[PDB]
Design a protein around this nucleic acid. Sequence first.
RNA 1: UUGACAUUGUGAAGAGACAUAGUUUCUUUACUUAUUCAAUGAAGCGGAGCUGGAUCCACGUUCUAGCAUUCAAGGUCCCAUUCGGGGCUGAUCCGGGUU
RNA 2: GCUUGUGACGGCCCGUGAAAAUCCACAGGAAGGAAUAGUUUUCAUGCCAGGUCGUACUGAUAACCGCAGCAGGUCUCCAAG
RNA 3: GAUGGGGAAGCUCCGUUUCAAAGGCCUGAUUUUAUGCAGGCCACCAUCGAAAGGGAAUCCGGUUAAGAUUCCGGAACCUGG
Lengths: 87, 13, 213, 52, 224
Amino acid sequence: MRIKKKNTRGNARNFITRSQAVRKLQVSLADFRRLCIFKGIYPREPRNKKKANKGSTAPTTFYYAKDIQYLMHEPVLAKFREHKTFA
Amino acid sequence: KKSTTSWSTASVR
Amino acid sequence: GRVIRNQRKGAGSIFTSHTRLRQGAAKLRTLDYAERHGYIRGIVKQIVHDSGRGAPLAKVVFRDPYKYRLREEIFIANEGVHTGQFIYAGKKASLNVGNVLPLGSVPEGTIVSNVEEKPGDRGALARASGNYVIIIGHNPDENKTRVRLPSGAKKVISSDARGVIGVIAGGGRVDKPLLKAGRAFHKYRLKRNSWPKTRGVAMNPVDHPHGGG
Amino acid sequence: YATVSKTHKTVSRAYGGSRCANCVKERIIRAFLIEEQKIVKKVVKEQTEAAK
Amino acid sequence: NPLTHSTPKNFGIGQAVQPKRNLSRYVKWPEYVRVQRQKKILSIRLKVPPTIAQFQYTLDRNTAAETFKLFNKYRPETAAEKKERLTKEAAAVSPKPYAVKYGLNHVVALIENKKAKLVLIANDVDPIELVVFLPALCKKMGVPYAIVKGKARLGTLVNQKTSAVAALTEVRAEDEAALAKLVSTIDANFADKYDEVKKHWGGGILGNKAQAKMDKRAKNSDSA
RNA sequence: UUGACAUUGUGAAGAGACAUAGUUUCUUUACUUAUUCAAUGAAGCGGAGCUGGAUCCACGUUCUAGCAUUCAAGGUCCCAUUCGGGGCUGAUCCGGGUU
RNA sequence: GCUUGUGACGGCCCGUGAAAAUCCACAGGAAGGAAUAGUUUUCAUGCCAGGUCGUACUGAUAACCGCAGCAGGUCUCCAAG
RNA sequence: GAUGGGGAAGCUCCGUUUCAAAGGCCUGAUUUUAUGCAGGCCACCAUCGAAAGGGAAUCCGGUUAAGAUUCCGGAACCUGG
Ligand SMILES: [Mg+2]
Ligand SMILES: [Mg+2]
Ligand SMILES: [Mg+2]
Ligand SMILES: [Mg+2]
Ligand SMILES: [Mg+2]
Ligand SMILES: [Mg+2]
Ligand SMILES: [Mg+2]
Ligand SMILES: [Mg+2]
Ligand SMILES: [Mg+2]
Ligand SMILES: [Mg+2]
């Protein structure tokens, strides 16, 4: 096995920031916040913030990556896209 | 239960 | 008849230049707004030998005018330029050895090197060691400059073409006898496969127009 | 170098690691003297413009 | 405030890094953007023969607004209300419809048979040969016509995306006077006003720098 | 290598042809818009400033192997003062041509 | 003493004698962080894991090529008195 | 040696970053017009090519008919979390 790359496993993979989550879900900020309120997705705190955010101490909103991945399959998101097309 | 297509949901929270 | 070496060289193959150890192409800066209107300062960091070239090269570092970083350029070193020297390039640069000036900003009798054939080609004339170009005169109405080339030819160039003040360093090189096939061998090992040369008379009639007897 | 502590890779000074002590001293001296000379040049030029 | 200081930046040559500036003039656009802009520029720069160049003189804003107000009262029967008419006719087993005529072949036939009261021709038709014969045909047959800006506007008139032409043939008694007044207005504002200048060549326009060069050279010749 | 035709456009001035109303033919001299060459980070081109100093210039950079980066500090109107956030400037304007 | 490694030096060139992955340091300072409590996984100790393919033997007057168990050919390391 | 492009009747050929819209990242209650994404940043090229070039980290003792820095016993180290 070759040497693995840092900042890819552990906190770095376990936590996803708000910008990354919005980009991955391909929605707007307003739609994303409303989806989180509907499903009960809540912000989270890594024990190692620098390890989670590539060494930065900047204040960041983090979520569970598996929570966002499960949020990808919510049919209300498809309803949001339908409403945009209708508008 | 097992996947038949490439995109699946399978509904486990 | 059989294809001769004069025709065989154009296909490339074993006649391509030997460029592993070369320092890089020796060019002036790209002609930009700073050199077109004012001047920009660089610093001579090192003077190095380039394999296959008689003239030494100088590595000159400038600041990037649009981004916080450094830019390294590879000049041909003029005689007298030393490490740690400040070099000034542009329209408003002073008449000092090592500076890069447009031809219209220098008076008659100025000695330049690495002169641009056209404004922006980054140096084409008087680049070999000990060679230089002399400014014969100006035609300000046509924005033109008459110069004398190392071969003796007189040329007319745009006055916006640039040049480096002074003479290419390394002069007097060809005055020393090589004395030896081995020294010619090492000279051409760093340039290209054109040595040794077999005389066409020495060949059979098939190999050359001159062969046979 | 990634297997050793920071003590082994630096010294307790500005540019410790990258630059040696005499070169650091030279850039300190030059920075100070050149900034003072810049103040002098601005003063001289302002006087020259005021009189001219 | 004792803690604040003024540190003005020198943005001259050989000084501080240049600030960000609007470089919209220097943007390397995509090839399709460059093509469409250069195509419009070429259509300006080249000398344009009169049969094409006549399509630069259209109805003015007020006349076009009144014309479209008239035609919107005769927008044709839509697909949703067509189905309602059919069910009513099956029960009966409907008066004569009034609508805008559209379609290039149909309108050409109506002009040739002199059934067209007023013809609107879109100026931005490509390929332009589909409409470049229409003004001469209308003049030859004695049909009032007007060149209007917007095939998309004509498409809104007849429930389509675009429409090269539209025509009014029959109008209601409540709008006969409006139609006649509009025809007189079009004759006074479009056909008579642009009658001479439609016989002139177009596109004798130089670019900005070439114009500046010509102006400088002429000034230099006239005064020293 | 040399000539022709096609690619091939727009002016102006001078010599003709309709018998002294402007449809064409040729020389001179221009132009750019087709075509051709080259470069770039398509970054500062072209013109003008009731811009400034003296037709020209930015008086923002030349003893020295330093430094130059976080929407730029400062100035001035606001907000609703709360950890700060906006706009005008700082850094003139215009263009239908990246050079 | 022999062999080998290495240092500080000298001679030589119209010859001045690879690249990249990768690792570190500095400059900078967006930021974050304590009083009845913070910070620091470049100090120590403690926890978990490390897949796939090769691996026998000859390397030559008989294990390779030369129709062969052919006096030919075929790159290299160690090396006592 | 592909792609973007351009040659060639065509099998295919040029060329290797150009001649391309060639993709990553940050912030947001965007002063709300009521259920539609806004403000910004940074930038150059696929891939293959070395069991003698570069390169993270392992040693001793024992053991077999035939294996061994790989197994057993003991003692370490590297990398990632
Ligand atoms: Mg012979
Ligand atoms: Mg073995
Ligand atoms: Mg063996
Ligand atoms: Mg054999
Ligand atoms: Mg055989
Ligand atoms: Mg190929
Ligand atoms: Mg490889
Ligand atoms: Mg190796
Ligand atoms: Mg064995
Ligand atoms: Mg073991």
